[PDB]
RNA sequence: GGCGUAAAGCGCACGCAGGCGGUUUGUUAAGUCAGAUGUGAAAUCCCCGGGCUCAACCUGGGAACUGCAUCUGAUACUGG
RNA sequence: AAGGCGGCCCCCUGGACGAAGACUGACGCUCAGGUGCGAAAGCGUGGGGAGCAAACAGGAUUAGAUACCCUGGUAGUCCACGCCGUAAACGAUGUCGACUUGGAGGUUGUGCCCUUGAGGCGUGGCUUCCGGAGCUAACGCGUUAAGUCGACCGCCUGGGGA
RNA sequence: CUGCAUGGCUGUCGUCAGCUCGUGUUGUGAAAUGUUGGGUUAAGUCCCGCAACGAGCGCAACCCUUAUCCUUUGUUGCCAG
């Protein structure tokens, strides 16, 4: 689950080369191997356990969490983990102003019911095919990005960033609002705007799946009443 | 509850292909009047919209200041891009000895007696930020004792 | 000239005519002369009353003017005496006997002519044009209109150089021909010239064309 | 207060007088720090009271005159 | 040090850096006056003068063209000793000390590793680009700071008149 | 008489394709993103990428005529038999 041994065989060692490392990452990085910085599990694991404890502490009570992992390979894993844990997520390009511009994104969220009526009802029955094709194309385009947050309604309570350097836009919008973020950073990331730092690999196929499984397990164990 | 107050309104312009289009800017200061203060600089095509635009941002961008019973704790100086502010705690009855865009924000914040002085360029836009940074950077005896590791009476 | 009149561009599609009859131009000129005379007489008489519009039908050897107004009580009078009083003059002006109908208009702040009216009265009584137009557009938006656009031009506020100000809310699709774009004009005779007012009120998209 | 661009780095280098000066001990105590004495006129300002019916004005005491000289000590810093 | 320095060879000489070693023991930094060096242009003497080229001659465009263009052409550019000490003499940033995240290089030493390739791990000197914090009105500077200081010198106080 | 006080109407750029706003963000601030960049087009038409997310006036469609066929009803319009 959170044991140190499983991460070694899953692969957390190689995060990035030694020419891309962020200067304020000295303490988390143990050393350099083959001109590639290697993270240390002896400090990776306890902070991850603390983050899991603090996250299930919120999961037990009320609160919605975000699962921003918008990578080219981790999208399916994020979607599966979110569906398993019964939480919300986004699996496409992070729309700038999704949390700080909720006053306007709520209109977009509320417009995939009256606009999806073309697909679930057809109005009469697929009225005016010439514009009905445009209607269904825009419906598909609209929920392609925000299909995982259509059942939220209110503002989220906690954030989970998989790539805290690629998704600094989400962190910037979370910070000025004031919601906790349990983000996992790489050797080339900044542990400044994130509230909880989880050093280690994030762009590996197996590491992201392991982290998603762990977070899903802890969030479904905290809220199991 | 709040003590919202407009400081000044300025008229800006922007030349375009068809001509010059005007615009208005509003600067406002809000606060509960006890220990909180915030500033808002809004811009809109008209004076009535700009003032509300500034007011909303001032309301939602307030800053809490750990002031004394009626004054500020210790004399402080704030430095901004073009304005320098100096604020000294006065005695009871002196009033808000300030000028420009400082006395209004000081009265909205909650302090009642302070000697304020502006050095450099005395523009409202920069002086408001300078005088709010001066109140943000200052600390209370309890706050300084917390980092010192001793008691207020010990660090008297 | 920039914009064409939005009524006579969709009169044949979604908008109704203000005069419904037939002629073989043996009497067409005198018929419109009579229509113009009765319309101007009604406008001059019912000044205090907020008349919305005047539709005219001309059957054989008879006429029927169906005035639409917001406050019909003033025109009606006690026991319906004022209408009988003002019906004989219309009948004798038009020659053939008349039968005046009066229709109350619901939502008096959502009619183009009504919203274009009384703003001239406010300007005459020296009410600021900006606040007047803002109140008119906000009331029209609140009542249910999907789009309102108000333009006021000429010697605004008694200045030295005339200008043209305008406000707009919602959406006003002037180019489409499948929507209610009810539009009317009015003018104010102030102490320093004349002020022109134009109002466009988009209510909805009338699918199917004429006859609902 | 500033000197890259508004006014402000000598074109550069050497160097006299001058300005400053790494680290430890002992000594001196010149600057510096403490106390005391004389003086720093009266007048004037300020504080507490009084007299002019109030005030202006006058007046008693106190404080102050931020300075100087001498004496008796303190030795951390600067100075020999 | 600045100005500046470009075939090769010889003669004399200044300066900088590094591996390890011992002493001299504050001898250290800056500098008003003062001295010295100081691009090119310029002047005096005695020479040299291929090319280039102020002044000048002719042609050409243009209303005019005492210029840009073309054909020649003197001083000058060259050598030695002399004189002035002027430049956007610019990094528009006066000398030194230590402190304050990184990446990619350039040049030049030095220790050790199987030097199988300009293989790797450290450490110095000079210098280029990007950039974090910080600073600045902004541009931008950013371990060679325009970031926080310390010691010294010079200069600035509205634009013209100057 | 004053279109150098105007209302209304009209010409031009141009039937060019741009012109703006709300929220958010960036810079103290005038302001910028959105509207740029890649394909694409008759086009701010669409897509992708991107501190942008949406909307309005706009580019199109709905409107009028004509290009084929079916049906309803044949005089003053037609002659398969
Ligand atoms: Mg100054
Ligand atoms: Mg200068
Ligand atoms: Mg200049
Ligand atoms: Mg210099
Ligand atoms: Mg000189
Ligand atoms: Mg002494
Ligand atoms: Mg003494
Ligand atoms: Mg008395
Ligand atoms: Mg005295
Ligand atoms: Mg000594
Ligand atoms: Mg040598
Ligand atoms: Mg000198
Ligand atoms: Mg020369
Ligand atoms: Mg020649
Ligand atoms: Mg020549
Ligand atoms: Mg010569
Ligand atoms: Mg000079
Ligand atoms: Mg210079
Ligand atoms: Mg020197
Ligand atoms: Mg060098
Ligand atoms: Mg840089």
UniProtKB/Swiss-Prot annotation, chain A:
InterPro entries: Ribosomal_uS2, Ribosomal_uS2_bac/mit/plastid, Ribosomal_uS2_CS, Ribosomal_uS2_flav_dom_sf
GO CC annotations, alphabetized: cytoplasm; cytosolic small ribosomal subunit
Molecular-function annotations in GO: structural constituent of ribosome; zinc ion binding
Pfam families given in the database record: Ribosomal_S2
Keyword tRNA processing: no
SUPFAM superfamilies linked: Ribosomal protein S2 (SSF52313)
Annotated keywords: Ribonucleoprotein, Ribosomal protein
Bridged cysteine pairs (disulfide): none
Listed transmembrane segments: none
Family statement: Belongs to the universal ribosomal protein uS2 family.
HAMAP family assigned: Ribosomal_uS2_B (MF_00291_B)
Name of the protein in its database record: Small ribosomal subunit protein uS2
Swiss-Prot record, chain B:
Gene3D superfamilies linked: 3.30.160.20, 3.30.230.10
Keyword Glycoprotein tagged: no
GO MF annotation terms: rRNA binding; structural constituent of ribosome
Highest taxon above the source species: Bacteria
InterPro entries membership: Ribosomal_Su5_D2-typ_SF, Ribosomal_uS5, Ribosomal_uS5_bac-type, Ribosomal_uS5_C, Ribosomal_uS5_N, Ribosomal_uS5_N_CS, Ribsml_uS5_D2-typ_fold_subgr
Domain remarks: The N-terminal domain interacts with the head of the 30S subunit; the C-terminal domain interacts with the body and contacts protein uS4. The interaction surface between uS4 and uS5 is involved in control of translational fidelity.
Protein name, UniProt field: Small ribosomal subunit protein uS5
Species of provenance: Escherichia coli (strain K12)
Lineage, uppermost ranks: Bacteria, Pseudomonadati, Pseudomonadota, Gammaproteobacteria, Enterobacterales
Swiss-Prot record, chain C:
Any Pfam family hit: Ribosomal_S3_C
Keyword NADP: no
Keyword Chaperone applies: no
InterPro entries xref list: KH_dom, KH_dom-like_a/b, KH_dom_type_2, KH_sf_prok-type, Ribosomal_S3_C_sf, Ribosomal_uS3_bac-typ, Ribosomal_uS3_C, Ribosomal_uS3_CS
GO molecular function: mRNA binding; rRNA binding; structural constituent of ribosome
Keywords, sorted A to Z: Ribonucleoprotein, Ribosomal protein, RNA-binding, rRNA-binding
GO cellular component: cytoplasm; cytosol; cytosolic small ribosomal subunit
SMART domains, per database record: KH
GO biological process: cytoplasmic translation; ribosomal small subunit assembly
Signal peptide annotation: none
All residue ranges annotated as the KH type-2 domain in the record: 38-106
Family: Belongs to the universal ribosomal protein uS3 family.
NCBIfam families: rpsC_bact
Quaternary structure, from the entry: Part of the 30S ribosomal subunit. Forms a tight complex with proteins uS10 and uS14. With proteins uS4 and uS5 encircles the mRNA as it enters the ribosome, which may play a role in mRNA helicase processivity. Some nascent polypeptide chains are able to cross-link to this protein in situ. In collided ribosomes contacts ribosome rescue factor SmrB.
Function: Binds the lower part of the 30S subunit head. Binds mRNA in the 70S ribosome, positioning it for translation.
Name of the molecule in the record: Small ribosomal subunit protein uS3
């Amino acid at each position: 689950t959170v044991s140190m041994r499983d991460m070694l065989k899953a692969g957390v060692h190689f995060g990035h080369q030694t020419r891309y490392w962020n200067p304020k990452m000295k303490p988390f990085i143990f050393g350099a191997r083959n001109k590639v910085h290697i993270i240390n599990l002896e400090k990776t694991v306890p902070m991850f356990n603390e983050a899991l404890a603090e996250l299930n502490k919120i999961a037990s009570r009320k609160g919605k969490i975000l699962f921003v992992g918008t990578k080219r390979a981790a999208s399916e894993a994020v979607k599966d983990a979110a569906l398993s844990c019964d939480q919300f997520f986004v699996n496409h390009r992070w729309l700038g102003g999704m949390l700080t511009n909720w006053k306007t994104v709520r209109q977009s969220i509320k417009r995939l019911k009256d606009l999806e009526t073309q697909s679930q009802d057809g109005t009469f029955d697929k009225l005016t095919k010439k514009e009905a094709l445009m209607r269904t194309r825009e419906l598909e385009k609209l929920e392609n990005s925000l299909g995982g947050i259509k059942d939220m309604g209110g503002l989220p309570d906690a954030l989970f960033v998989i790539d805290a350097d690629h998704e600094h836009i989400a962190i910037k919008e979370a910070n000025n609002l004031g919601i906790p973020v349990f983000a996992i950073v790489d050797t080339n990331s900044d542990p400044d705007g994130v509230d909880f730092v989880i050093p280690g690999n994030d762009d590996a196929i197996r590491a992201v799946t392991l982290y998603l499984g762990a977070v899903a397990a802890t969030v479904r164990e905290g809220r199991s009443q | 509850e709040l003590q919202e107050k407009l400081i000044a309104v300025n008229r800006v312009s922007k030349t375009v292909k068809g001509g010059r289009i005007f615009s208005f800017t509003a600067l406002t200061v809000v606060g509960d009047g006890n220990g909180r203060v915030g500033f808002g600089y809004g811009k809109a095509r008209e004076v009535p919209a700009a003032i509300q635009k500034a007011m909303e941002k001032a309301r939602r961008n307030m800053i809490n200041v750990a002031l004394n019973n009626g004054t500020l704790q210790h004399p402080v100086k704030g430095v901004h891009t073009g304005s320098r502010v100096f604020m000294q705690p006065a005695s009871e009855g002196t009033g808000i000895i300030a000028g420009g865009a400082m006395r209004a924000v000081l009265e909205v914040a909650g302090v009642h007696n302070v000697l304020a002085k502006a050095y450099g360029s005395t523009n409202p836009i920069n002086v408001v930020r300078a005088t709010i940074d001066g109140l943000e950077n200052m600390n209370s005896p309890e706050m300084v004792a917390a980092k010192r590791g001793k008691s207020v009476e010990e660090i008297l | 000239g920039q914009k064409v009149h939005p009524n006579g561009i969709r009169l044949g599609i979604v908008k109704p005519w203000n005069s419904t009859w037939f002629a073989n131009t043996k009497e067409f000129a005198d018929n419109l002369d009579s229509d113009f005379k009765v319309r101007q007489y009604l406008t001059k008489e019912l000044a205090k009353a907020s008349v919305s519009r005047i539709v005219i039908e001309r059957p054989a050897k008879s006429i029927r003017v169906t005035i639409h107004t917001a406050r019909p009580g003033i025109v009606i009078g006690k026991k319906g005496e004022d209408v009988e009083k003002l019906r004989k003059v219309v009948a004798d002006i038009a020659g053939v006997p008349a039968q005046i109908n009066i229709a109350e208009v619901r939502k008096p702040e959502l009619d183009a002519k009504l919203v274009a009216d009384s703003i001239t009265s406010q300007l005459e009584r020296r009410v600021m044009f900006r606040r007047a137009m803002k109140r008119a557009v906000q009331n029209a938006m609140r009542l249910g209109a999907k789009g309102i656009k108000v333009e006021v031009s000429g010697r605004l506020g008694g200045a030295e150089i005339a200008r043209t100000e305008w406000y707009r809310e919602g959406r006003v699709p002037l180019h489409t021909l499948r929507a209610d774009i009810d539009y009317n004009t009015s003018e104010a005779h102030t102490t320093y010239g004349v002020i022109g007012v134009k109002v466009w009120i988009f209510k909805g998209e009338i699918l199917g064309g004429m006859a609902a």
